[PDB]
Amino acid sequence: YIILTFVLLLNMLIALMGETVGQVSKESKHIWKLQWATTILDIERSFPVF
């Protein structure tokens, strides 16, 4: 039980290590840019037309 739990922890560490980080280092920039732009447009639409 203990050994296999440790193995699951190790496996999760590896999966977050390579596959997640390699993609994140590029995808986070673009996702943040999209969030920033959509918040700007929401703030615009909040104000009245005039």
Partner: protein, 37 residues
């Protein structure tokens, strides 16, 4: 993930176990040889 679990269990886990057993058996002999009954 299944592939990860399988490879972690087989490839390097037994390797680490072998080294760990090596140090464990050496220390067991060294530690218990000193004791006097």
């Amino acid at each position: 993930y299944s592939i990860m679990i399988q490879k972690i269990l087989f490839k390097d886990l037994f390797r680490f176990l072998l080294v760990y057993l090596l140090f464990m058996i050496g220390y067991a002999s060294a530690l218990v040889s000193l004791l006097n009954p």
